Amino acid sequence: GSHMQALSYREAVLRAVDRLNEQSSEANLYRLLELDQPPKADEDPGTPKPVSFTVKETVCPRPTRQPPELCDFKENGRVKQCVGTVTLDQIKDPLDITCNEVQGV
Structure with a gap:
């Protein structure tokens, strides 16, 4: 409803990463790395x-009871770069973002 004082990009990525999962x-969760x-x-x-x-495969599968951040991270998992554009005030769907697998080993 009313969002008094609510304008942060980090918060938008937190909701975008959880909505994407x-x-x-996918089979496993991918928290933002x-x-x-x-x-x-x-x-x-x-x-x-x-x-x-960039998001990486977490030890918890999807969907988990809590968010993917609550669980651990699998360094052996694959990492993907999810990028797109979405408003921060009137968040709408679907989130038009593409994820490009990033190699980090």
């Missing part, structure tokens, strides 16, 4: 906000 049909700093990430409220981050 529930919307995607590293977050990137896209162009204009905190200067467009009504407009869309570009978001980008």
